Symmetry: C15
Subunit: 82 residues, 15 copies
Amino acid sequence: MESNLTTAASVIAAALAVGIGSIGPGLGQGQAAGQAVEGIARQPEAEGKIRGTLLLSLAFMEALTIYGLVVALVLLFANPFV
Amino acid sequence: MESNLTTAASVIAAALAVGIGSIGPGLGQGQAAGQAVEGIARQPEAEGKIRGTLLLSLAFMEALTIYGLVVALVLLFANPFV
Amino acid sequence: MESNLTTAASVIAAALAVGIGSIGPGLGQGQAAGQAVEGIARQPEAEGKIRGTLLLSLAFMEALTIYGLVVALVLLFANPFV
Amino acid sequence: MESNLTTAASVIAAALAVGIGSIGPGLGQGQAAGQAVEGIARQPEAEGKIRGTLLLSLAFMEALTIYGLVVALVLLFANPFV
Amino acid sequence: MESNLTTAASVIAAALAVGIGSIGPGLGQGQAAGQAVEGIARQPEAEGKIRGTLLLSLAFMEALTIYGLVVALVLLFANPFV
Amino acid sequence: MESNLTTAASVIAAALAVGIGSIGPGLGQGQAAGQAVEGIARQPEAEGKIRGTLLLSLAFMEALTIYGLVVALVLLFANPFV
Amino acid sequence: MESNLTTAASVIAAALAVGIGSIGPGLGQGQAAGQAVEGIARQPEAEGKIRGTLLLSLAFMEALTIYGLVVALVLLFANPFV
Amino acid sequence: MESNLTTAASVIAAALAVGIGSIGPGLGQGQAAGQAVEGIARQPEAEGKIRGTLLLSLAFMEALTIYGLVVALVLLFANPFV
Amino acid sequence: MESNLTTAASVIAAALAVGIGSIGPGLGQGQAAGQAVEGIARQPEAEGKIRGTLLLSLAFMEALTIYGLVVALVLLFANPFV
Amino acid sequence: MESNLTTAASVIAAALAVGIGSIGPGLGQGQAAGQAVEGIARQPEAEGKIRGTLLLSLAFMEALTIYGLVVALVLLFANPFV
Amino acid sequence: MESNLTTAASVIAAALAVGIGSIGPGLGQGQAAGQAVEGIARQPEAEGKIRGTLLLSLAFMEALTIYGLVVALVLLFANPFV
Amino acid sequence: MESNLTTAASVIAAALAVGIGSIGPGLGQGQAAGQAVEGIARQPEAEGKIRGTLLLSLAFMEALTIYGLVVALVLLFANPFV
Amino acid sequence: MESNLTTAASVIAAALAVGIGSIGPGLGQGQAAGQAVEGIARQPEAEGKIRGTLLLSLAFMEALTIYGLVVALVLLFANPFV
Amino acid sequence: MESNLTTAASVIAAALAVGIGSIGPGLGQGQAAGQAVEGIARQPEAEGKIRGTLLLSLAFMEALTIYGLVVALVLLFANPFV
Amino acid sequence: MESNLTTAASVIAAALAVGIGSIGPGLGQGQAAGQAVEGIARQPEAEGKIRGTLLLSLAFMEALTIYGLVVALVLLFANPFV
Ligand SMILES: OC[C@H]1O[C@H](O[C@H]2[C@H](O)[C@@H](O)[C@H](OCCCCC3CCCCC3)O[C@@H]2CO)[C@H](O)[C@@H](O)[C@@H]1O
Ligand SMILES: OC[C@H]1O[C@H](O[C@H]2[C@H](O)[C@@H](O)[C@H](OCCCCC3CCCCC3)O[C@@H]2CO)[C@H](O)[C@@H](O)[C@@H]1O
Ligand SMILES: OC[C@H]1O[C@H](O[C@H]2[C@H](O)[C@@H](O)[C@H](OCCCCC3CCCCC3)O[C@@H]2CO)[C@H](O)[C@@H](O)[C@@H]1O
Ligand SMILES: OC[C@H]1O[C@H](O[C@H]2[C@H](O)[C@@H](O)[C@H](OCCCCC3CCCCC3)O[C@@H]2CO)[C@H](O)[C@@H](O)[C@@H]1O
Ligand SMILES: OC[C@H]1O[C@H](O[C@H]2[C@H](O)[C@@H](O)[C@H](OCCCCC3CCCCC3)O[C@@H]2CO)[C@H](O)[C@@H](O)[C@@H]1O
Ligand SMILES: OC[C@H]1O[C@H](O[C@H]2[C@H](O)[C@@H](O)[C@H](OCCCCC3CCCCC3)O[C@@H]2CO)[C@H](O)[C@@H](O)[C@@H]1O
Ligand SMILES: OC[C@H]1O[C@H](O[C@H]2[C@H](O)[C@@H](O)[C@H](OCCCCC3CCCCC3)O[C@@H]2CO)[C@H](O)[C@@H](O)[C@@H]1O
Ligand SMILES: OC[C@H]1O[C@H](O[C@H]2[C@H](O)[C@@H](O)[C@H](OCCCCC3CCCCC3)O[C@@H]2CO)[C@H](O)[C@@H](O)[C@@H]1O
Ligand SMILES: OC[C@H]1O[C@H](O[C@H]2[C@H](O)[C@@H](O)[C@H](OCCCCC3CCCCC3)O[C@@H]2CO)[C@H](O)[C@@H](O)[C@@H]1O
Ligand SMILES: OC[C@H]1O[C@H](O[C@H]2[C@H](O)[C@@H](O)[C@H](OCCCCC3CCCCC3)O[C@@H]2CO)[C@H](O)[C@@H](O)[C@@H]1O
Ligand SMILES: OC[C@H]1O[C@H](O[C@H]2[C@H](O)[C@@H](O)[C@H](OCCCCC3CCCCC3)O[C@@H]2CO)[C@H](O)[C@@H](O)[C@@H]1O
Ligand SMILES: OC[C@H]1O[C@H](O[C@H]2[C@H](O)[C@@H](O)[C@H](OCCCCC3CCCCC3)O[C@@H]2CO)[C@H](O)[C@@H](O)[C@@H]1O
Ligand SMILES: OC[C@H]1O[C@H](O[C@H]2[C@H](O)[C@@H](O)[C@H](OCCCCC3CCCCC3)O[C@@H]2CO)[C@H](O)[C@@H](O)[C@@H]1O
Ligand SMILES: OC[C@H]1O[C@H](O[C@H]2[C@H](O)[C@@H](O)[C@H](OCCCCC3CCCCC3)O[C@@H]2CO)[C@H](O)[C@@H](O)[C@@H]1O
Ligand SMILES: OC[C@H]1O[C@H](O[C@H]2[C@H](O)[C@@H](O)[C@H](OCCCCC3CCCCC3)O[C@@H]2CO)[C@H](O)[C@@H](O)[C@@H]1O
């Protein structure tokens, strides 16, 4: 067990990476998904096309927060300093 | 028992990870779900397709906050420093 | 019977987790629910399908805040440090 | 009568949990309720179905703030530290 | 009579609980009530139904702020610490 | 005459309770009242119904700020500590 | 003359009570008054009814800021501490 | 001929009362006035009724800022403390 | 030439009163004026009535900032303390 | 030549007065001017009337910021303290 | 070369005057200019009238930021204190 | 191992880079993707064209956050200072 | 070389002048340019007139940020103090 | 391995440049891309022209964040001070 | 080989200039570009005129951020002080 400025900064940093990192992607995924289901209601025959394009987009957005998760996990499990 | 800068930072970090981490996904899930039920009212025959696409979307958004939860749980139950 | 930096941080953390954690889900639940009842007025025959999809959505959003509650309850009743 | 950092933090925490915890749910309940009464005006025959879905939604949103209230009451009446 | 960190924090906390606690519910009640009166103008025969659903909703929202008031009153009249 | 941390905190708290406490209710009352007078212009024969429902709603919103006023008056005229 | 932490806090508190206390009611009165004059243009025969309902509404909103004024005047002319 | 904490606080307080106190009323007066002139263009025969209702509304809103002015003038010309 | 806490506070106060005091009224005047010129374009024959109501409104809003200017000039040219 | 708390505060205050003081009037002038040119396109025969009402309005708004400038210039060229 | 609190405050003040001072006018000019070019597209024969009124308005808005520039230049090239 | 001001700043910086860096791109991707799926519903024959343009756009936006990730990874795995 | 409070203030000031100074003009230029290209699509014969008016507008807005640039360059290359 | 105020400031600076630098461009790219795919759905034959203009615009916006990246890389790999 | 207040301020300043300086231009470029591609879909024959006007606009906006880049590069490569 060690406590210093950098261990303290590391745990806070981990939380900020994943917490702040979910704001834009969370909102964005809701916007895209909302238009997708509205589109399916409008044109059910296009569901396959809509679903595929939504899935691609959700993946691009999810990755943004995953970058934050990666930084958090490095800070907690592969910390370069402490 | 143990109290130091890093234990104090850890408990605050845990709260911020899940607290802030729910803001975007919470708003986004509401946006998507709202469009989904609006679409069902418009085209009830499309309910299956709509429900399926919404569920996928809700899972992508839920995962974002779960990343915050995971950081929180690591900080409380598998803390690397303290 | 105990006051230090980490006990003080823990109580504040518990409050921030549930307090901040209800903001996005609270707003999102209202958005989804509002569209659900608008949908029911528009197409009463679809009420069952709308209600089922809404309930699923409300559960996904409620869970987000419950993650904050879980962190808060760990901090108050199973605190790892103090 | 006792005063320390943790008792002071506890009273502030109790207020923040219930205060901040009412923001999203209060706004969301107004949004849902507003669409409900607009829906009843549009289709008075669907009032029973609208009211039932509204009530379910109001409960989900009210619960979010109740989590904040629970934290506040624990901090004030079952404080684990002070 | 008595002044220390905790009495000072208690009076601030009491004000924050009711002050912040009225923001969401205040805005939400206005939104729901505005839709209610618009609905009554649109369909006066639905006034009884609209009024009843509004009353229910106003009570759910009012309760959110009353949680803030309860905390404030505990802090002022049944303070566990000071 | 006495001046200490708690007398100072009490006067500030009193102002914050009543000041912040008027923000949501003030906005909400304007929203509801605006829709009420728009409704009366649309359907003058519904004025009695609209006025009654508006009055009920204005009372619910006014009470939210009154809770803030009560806390302020307790702090200034029935202060538990100073 | 008298200068201490509490006199300094009192003058600032007085300003915040009326200053912040006018924000919501000011915006809300404008919203309501705007809809009222719009309604009069639409249905001049409804002017009496509209004016009456607006006046009631303006009074409910004005009272909110008056509560802030009362706290301010107490702090300056009937201060309980200083 | 006099400088202390309370003289410094008083001058800042005077400025905050009138400065912050003009924000909501300024915006609300513009909203009401804008709808009034739009109403007059729409229905010039109703100009008298619109103007009378606007003037009443402008007075209610102006008063809100005047409360801030009154606090400021008390602080500068009838200061209870300094 | 004198410098103390109160002279420094006085100059800042003067700037805040006039600076902050122009925000709401500036926005509100633009809103009112914009609707006025749109109204004149719609109904050129109502220009006299529109201009008269606009001028009255502009005066009410200008006065709000003038209260801020009065406070600033008192602080600079008739300071009660320094 | 001379540097003390009050000279430092005076230069900051001067900048704040004109800087902040241009925010509302800048936005408001754009709003009014945009409606003016839209109105001229709609009804070119009303150009003279529109231009005159706009000029009057622009002057009311410009004056708001000029109050900020006047304070800044007093602080720089006729400073009562330093 | 001299460095003191007031030289430091002066350079910051200069930047704030011109930086903050461009926010409202920049936004406002874009709003006015956008409506002007939309108007020209709608009625090309009114271009001369539109351009003239836009130019007048752009000048009024540009002057607001120029006041900030003047304060900045006084602070840097005709500083009353340093 | 090593803790100093710069190791502490490095972990915070890494989190800020990826955290803040995902806000704009997250929101932007959702906006573009939502329009894409709406477009596919409108014109399913354009799906290939829409998908290709969306993919290109998603990549431009994803790269923005990847710049944040690159900085974070340099700070953690190739830190020039510590 | 030279380092003191004023050199440090100068470099920060320079950045704030151009950084903050681009916010309003950047947004405003986009608004104006967007309406311009929309107008060209609507009325291609008006392109010359539209382009000319836009160019004038862009120059007025660009100048606002250039004022910030000038302050920045003075602070770096013609600093009056340091 | 070196730590001082400037190395710490450098790492924070690198993160802020790329983090903050992605906000406007990320949002702007989403807006442009969204209109592009909506346009392709409207007029599939214009896809080539739309895609070309989009790509040009995306490059202009991407460059803005790349300036932030360049600053970050200089601070990390070609630091002029430390 | 050099750390002091001004080197630390310089690196932060460089980051703020380009970081903050991209916010408005980034958003404005997206707005203009979005309208351009919408315009092209609407009127493909006007693509050349639209593209030419857009490119001119994008250059004006890009320049605003380049001013921030110039300040940053002066601070890093031609620093007048350190
Ligand atoms: O008190 C003993 C410790 O002293 C140093 O850390 C000190 C540090 O100097 C001091 O500024 C610090 O107080 C500063 C509080 C800053 C809190 C920080 C803000 C954002 C990042 C997360 C939390 O306390 C540390 C306690 O660890 C060393 O880092 C460490 O080696 C040693 O264990
Ligand atoms: O980090 C290691 C050290 O940390 C504590 O020391 C100090 C620490 O230096 C000091 O900055 C700290 O006060 C710093 C204020 C706490 C602010 C911080 C902000 C982020 C969220 C958590 C709260 O108090 C500790 C108690 O005295 C422990 O008491 C000490 O035993 C331990 O060695
Ligand atoms: O173990 C904690 C110990 O911390 C104390 O040191 C410090 C310690 O930073 C803190 O209590 C106090 O500063 C605490 C200020 C920050 C409060 C914190 C902010 C966010 C998280 C919730 C509340 O000052 C003490 C000065 O003695 C003392 O060492 C001791 O009284 C106490 O037991
Ligand atoms: O750790 C508990 C200790 O806390 C008490 O107050 C200490 C405390 O450390 C310190 O932060 C306090 O200043 C606290 C300033 C911030 C208080 C606020 C409370 C809730 C919101 C977050 C932070 O003043 C005292 C310093 O002498 C006393 O030191 C003592 O009664 C007690 O042992
Ligand atoms: O916490 C209990 C202690 O209360 C006092 O602590 C002192 C403490 O040292 C000092 O930092 C504290 O000033 C700290 C200022 C923080 C005020 C706080 C901020 C947010 C919450 C509301 C107000 O004042 C206390 C009251 O005088 C006395 O020291 C003594 O009665 C007792 O030890
Ligand atoms: O200076 C004498 C007084 O000392 C204490 O109060 C001290 C206190 O410790 C100290 O932190 C305080 O300075 C702290 C300033 C905090 C201002 C506070 C912020 C939010 C709440 C309203 C205002 O000054 C007090 C002056 O009364 C005791 O509270 C009081 O018994 C005693 O009269
Ligand atoms: O509260 C009681 C005491 O208060 C004053 O003492 C101190 C006080 O302790 C100290 O914190 C205070 O500085 C505190 C900074 C003021 C901040 C405060 C924030 C809320 C709005 C009002 C301003 O200065 C006073 C002057 O020295 C009086 O000078 C003293 O005579 C009196 O006994
Ligand atoms: O009666 C006030 C007395 O206050 C002084 O103590 C303190 C006092 O807190 C204040 O002046 C100063 O700190 C003042 C900082 C807060 C300024 C305040 C903030 C909001 C309200 C407007 C301005 O430092 C002094 C240090 O001597 C000295 O005791 C004396 O010079 C003065 O007369
Ligand atoms: O109360 C007046 C006294 O104020 C002067 O400045 C004092 C003052 O107390 C203190 O707050 C000041 O720091 C003031 C920091 C905050 C100043 C700012 C001004 C307007 C906006 C709110 C607060 O520095 C000096 C400390 O030595 C000198 O102490 C003296 O010339 C004079 O007697
Ligand atoms: O107020 C007059 C006094 O001016 C000086 O006060 C000192 C004072 O002690 C110190 O706290 C102060 O630093 C306080 C930093 C606050 C700077 C202020 C913040 C907002 C308004 C613009 C800038 O600096 C003053 C200038 O050196 C000198 O002490 C002396 O010339 C005289 O007594
Ligand atoms: O250190 C020597 C200098 O001491 C004084 O200035 C001191 C001053 O008292 C002190 O509060 C100051 O530290 C206070 C830092 C406040 C920074 C300020 C915040 C907003 C306005 C721009 C920057 O450092 C100054 C250094 O010049 C005198 O102003 C000056 O005559 C003298 O050259
Ligand atoms: O900068 C290198 C220095 O690092 C340490 O500095 C100390 C320094 O004195 C102290 O003010 C510092 O506490 C300052 C608190 C600021 C924390 C910072 C805020 C934003 C960026 C992330 C975290 O802590 C350092 C670490 O203990 C040690 O003094 C020593 O290892 C070395 O001289
Ligand atoms: O202003 C004149 C003096 O300024 C410096 O002194 C001091 C100064 O007093 C002190 O407040 C300063 O620390 C103040 C903190 C810096 C904050 C400031 C905020 C605005 C943007 C720039 C950064 O550090 C300097 C270094 O010790 C120089 O080191 C000194 O040689 C020179 O005489
Ligand atoms: O000027 C470089 C010096 O800086 C180091 O850290 C010093 C430094 O002056 C001080 O501000 C530091 O606290 C720094 C607190 C704020 C740090 C943060 C960093 C980036 C974002 C802006 C500000 O702690 C140390 C105090 O002992 C050490 O003093 C020394 O290793 C080195 O010579
Ligand atoms: O020439 C700068 C000198 O400054 C130091 O004094 C001061 C100096 O204010 C600063 O480094 C440190 O405080 C720096 C705090 C502010 C950091 C600043 C904030 C915005 C701009 C970027 C970063 O503490 C030192 C205490 O020694 C020392 O005199 C010396 O270590 C250093 O060389």
